[PDB]
């Protein structure tokens, strides 16, 4: 609830603004910033057949997109960034995955922000 | 109504063919205009740099065109399309010129208007502004000699002091979809180009007399440069307006076509139920 | 009875030529309604010019329309009808304003009706 | 209950003038579906700007919508609803953007919602 | 069969082009060439009531439009160039008409080109 | 069946690219119809070339065609067409006359058919 309740309504707004922007000639800064997050969300919602994602891993990848850490990564890489984060969570970040399951609740923001920056150092691009 | 929808689908289909016809012909004209303009681009560099170098090197400011003066009254040159159907092109240049004059000039007498294009003259005839010179009906591809005489009229009005400051308002071609409403100052030449490489020049022509030739030849060169960009940008604006118009029309044809098929299948299920309802009773 | 031998060659020529003008005006009205009349060619403009006049000149003042329209009424002989429609097609009377062609019987009348308007 | 005597002349004149602007824009809609707003001239441009303002200022935040969207609700008394439409119709709020007119109760709320954007 | 094949392609390349470009004053030089032969084709196919045409004469007028002999002639007089050509063929060109009826076949190109080019000299 | 579970991954990649290449050419076709071939950008020419060869290599010499023509005809196994189209999409064979690809079978037939011209 805390992570993603404004996603359904905000994502409809990108659909119209993309349709206008293709025929549009010159856009402004607040329209261009909205166009950059919308593309990542559409690639974060792409899945593959017969591969379900556990709910604790869902809330962690969506926290990255809503809080804006995924803004740095170029688009085609988003799908691989998502497979890698899930592997890393498994190998390294076990404490975050224990808290969400028992309390159905999100951990301390400092510890989560620390962890996502730590993954982003290890990740490489193109 | 089944009869009515069929008329709209047929009208939208026919008008989609004309919007496509004007898209393709605009493409052909744009390609030529960029080529023709690029042919006068070398001419423009040659003339503008040599005349600037002699006007700014080895001599002071001793020309009415070079020298700055305090402005008793001013003018605007605004260049616009003859025919329509090009989107936002006319409005966005008129928007800048209208907003500029009212915001920084507080008397009708303060400003005067020179206009190229029927839509500009129309906008000035509606609302209210005077026009000193209003040339129209230029050919699709301009020649130098068209504005040789019209420019001669404008430089006479400047040179004799009728206006003390003069501005151009025109569209500049940057990209296949993006074009830029822009303003530059034709006169006085408060600033000038500088190659930084000069050669000994004949000292026999009187400096003022020598300038009397090169200043108007620079002024004509600047105005023609604006026509090259203006015509190129007008042709591109019609081409995208035509692309988007055709795409909207074809989308409307699929949306309308489905309404016709749903109406046609309902009319054939009503007639068969009324028939069978009477047949079951008898 | 609209056959070249049943009505004469001069009659048939004029009749089919009117029917081309009015079919061309029908397709062109779709283009005018969405894109606008100024967008089009000189031949397309001249079709719309003549088709407006032809369509209004097919209207007539009847004696039974004395009750409905005040004005008394007219009888146009066939020879006259051919002369007049030929003039509209050849452009002789195109200077006159279009409202003058509504509810009139002979082309002579259309010239006077225009005079009252002031043309 | 829409009659001068029942509502008062100020409410009646405001309601009818709002319904006249909305009907003109339901006819302009057939041409702006294809060409966009380059074809439109003069009164057509001003009418579409004010129709966009009116159509979004008829939308409200409900207390029963709190289970769907996190916003609080609003109750707008009648004397306030009429005053806002008149300032929109006069053109006193022409400068403010269309996205600031959505899901609000009173005209004061549109000014603070615009100021949050700064547009 | 040889003459009719080109026409089906020619009428089609006009219906597509005309449905958009008849009004445009100047388009590419080809597009002008296709449009011009497009009008002539729709005037060579026009015919009068209760007057049938024998097959040998049909193949000759269709050979001439397809091979470009009728470009010089304007669209209005295509309906008369047709008639004058039928007269010239009867008085002078009896040899060409003899072969097509008997062998259902076309004569030597040089002879046909010679007859049609000569008539194009006579026409005014 | 054109999904990577049924056809396998090599086939799926080769197929999607062919569709991507042909669709883009359908666009440049109306630009090339209005204006000249020199006008296209270099990258756009590198897509015009591949599309013309791909369109022709789709054409095949049938055995029942020998009544309508004078050539024997061929059958191609699915592995041989998947291999061949991968070579064309990597450009290994672009040093070839266009009509070399007309009504042919395996890609090695193109090599020999080229020699036939010279």
For residue B166 the two structure tokens come to 């003069």
Measured between alpha carbons, how far is D82 from D100 in angstroms, rounded to an integer?
Answer: 19
Name B182's bridge partners: B170
CB pairs under 8 A between B and D: 21
Residues of C in contact with D31 (CB under 8 A): 34
- In chain F, the number of structural domains is 1
CB pairs under 8 A between C and D: 5
Q: Are F88 and F53 in contact (CB under 8 A)?
A: yes
Q: Span B24-240: which CATH code?
A: 3.40.1380.10
Those residues with Cβ within 8 angstroms of residue D91's Cβ, 6 or more apart along the chain or in another chain: D50
Does C37 touch chain B if contact means CB atoms closer than 8 Å? no
Closest Cα in chain B to C29: B11
Q: Are B53 and B194 in contact (CB under 8 A)?
A: yes
The experimental method behind these coordinates is cryo-EM
Q: Are C112 and C101 in contact (CB under 8 A)?
A: no
Measured between alpha carbons, how far is F17 from F8 in angstroms, rounded to an integer?
Answer: 15
List E residues 11-40 in contact with B (Cβ-Cβ < 8 A).
19-21, 23-24, 27-28
Containing structural domain, residue C41: 2-119
For the stretch A101-109, contacts whose Cβ atoms lie closer than 8 Å and that sit 24 or more positions apart, written own/partner, are A101/A56, A106/A2, A106/A3, A106/A59, A106/A63
Tally of CB atoms within 10 A around D68? 9
- State the Cα angle at D54 between D48 and D59, rounded to 5°: 135
User: In this structure, what is the dihedral angle of CA atoms B210, B215, B217, B220, given to the nearest 10 degrees?
Assistant: -170
What does each C-alpha distance from A55 to A3, A52, F47 come to in angstroms?
A: 12, 9, 45
Which residues in chain A are followed by a discontinuity, with C-to-N distance exceeding 2.5 angstroms?
none
Measured between alpha carbons, how far is D87 from F76 in angstroms, rounded to an integer?
Answer: 77
State whether the Cα torsion F1-F3-F8-F11 is positive or negative: positive
Contact E20 B17 (CB under 8 A): yes
Residue with tokens 């020619």: E10
Measured between alpha carbons, how far is C62 from C72 in angstroms, rounded to an integer?
Answer: 7
Q: Where are the alpha helices (DSSP H) in chain F?
A: 4-7, 9-34, 42-58, 78-90, 107-117
Does B27 touch chain F if contact means CB atoms closer than 8 Å? yes
Q: What are the residue boundaries of the structural domains of chain B, listed by start?
A: 24-240
Measured between alpha carbons, how far is C101 from B75 in angstroms, rounded to an integer?
Answer: 49
Q: Are B34 and B229 in contact (CB under 8 A)?
A: no
Contact C40 E23 (CB under 8 A): yes
Tally of CB atoms within 10 A around C106? 15
- State the Cα angle at B238 between B235 and B239, rounded to 5°: 85
Resolution for this PDB entry, in angstroms: 3.1
Measured between alpha carbons, how far is D99 from D110 in angstroms, rounded to an integer?
Answer: 9
Q: Are B65 and B102 in contact (CB under 8 A)?
A: no
Q: Work out the minimum CA distance from D31 to partner chain C, whole angstroms.
A: 7
Residue E47 counted as an annotated binding residue: yes
């Amino acid at each position: 609830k805390k992570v993603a309740g404004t996603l359904r309504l905000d994502l409809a707004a990108y659909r119209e603004l993309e349709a206008f922007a293709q025929f549009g000639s010159d856009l402004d800064k607040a329209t261009q910033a909205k166009l950059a997050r919308g593309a990542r969300t559409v690639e974060v919602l792409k899945q593959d057949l017969h591969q379900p994602i556990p709910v604790e891993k869902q809330v962690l990848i969506i926290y990255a997109l809503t809080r804006g850490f995924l803004d740095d990564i170029p688009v085609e890489d988003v799908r691989r960034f998502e497979k890698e984060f899930y592997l890393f969570l498994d190998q390294n970040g076990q404490h975050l995955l224990e808290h969400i399951r028992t309390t159905k609740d999100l951990p301390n923001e400092d510890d989560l922000n620390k962890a996502i920056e730590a993954f982003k150092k290890t990740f490489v691009v193109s | 109504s089944l009869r009515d929808i069929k008329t709209r689908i047929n009208a939208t289909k026919k008008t989609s063919q004309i919007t496509k016809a004007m898209e393709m012909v605009s493409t052909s004209k744009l390609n030529r205009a960029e080529q023709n303009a690029k042919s006068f681009v070398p001419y423009m560099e040659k003339i503008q740099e040599v005349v600037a170098n002699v006007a700014l090197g080895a001599g002071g400011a001793s020309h009415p065109m070079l020298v700055s003066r305090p402005v008793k009254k001013t003018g605007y040159l605004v260049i616009t399309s003859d025919r329509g159907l090009a989107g936002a092109y006319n409005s966005n240049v008129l928007r800048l010129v209208y907003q500029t004059i009212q915001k920084r000039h507080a008397c009708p007498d303060e400003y005067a208007i020179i206009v190229i294009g029927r839509v500009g003259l129309s906008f000035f005839r509606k609302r209210n502004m005077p026009v000193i010179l209003d040339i129209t009906r230029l050919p699709d591809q301009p020649s130098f000699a068209d504005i040789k005489e019209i420019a001669r009229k404008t430089v006479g009005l400047f040179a004799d002091g009728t206006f003390d400051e003069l501005y151009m308002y025109y569209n500049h071609y940057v990209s296949a979809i993006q074009q830029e409403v822009t303003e530059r100052k034709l006169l006085p030449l408060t600033d000038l180009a500088e190659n930084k490489q000069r050669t000994v020049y004949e000292f026999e022509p009187s400096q003022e007399e020598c300038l009397d030739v090169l200043l108007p030849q620079y002024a004509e060169s600047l105005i023609y440069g604006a026509l090259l960009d203006a015509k190129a940008s007008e042709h591109a604006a019609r081409m995208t307006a035509m692309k988007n118009a055709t795409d909207n029309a074809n989308e409307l044809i699929r949306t309308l076509t489905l309404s016709y098929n749903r109406a046609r299948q309902a009319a054939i299920t009503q007639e068969i139920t009324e028939i069978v309802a009477g047949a079951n009773a008898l | 009875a609209l056959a070249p031998e049943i009505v004469g060659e001069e009659h048939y020529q004029v009749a089919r030529k009117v029917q081309q003008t009015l079919q061309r005006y029908k397709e062109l009205q779709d283009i005018i309604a969405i894109l606008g009349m100024d967008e089009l060619s000189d031949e397309d403009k001249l079709v719309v010019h003549r088709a407006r006049r032809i369509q209004f000149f097919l209207s007539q003042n009847f004696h039974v329309a004395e009750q409905f329209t005040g004005q008394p009424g007219s009888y146009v002989p066939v020879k006259e009808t051919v002369r007049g429609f030929k003039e509209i097609l050849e452009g002789k009377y195109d200077h006159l304003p279009e409202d003058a062609f509504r509810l009139v019987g002979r082309i002579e009348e259309v010239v006077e009706k225009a005079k009252a308007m002031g043309v």
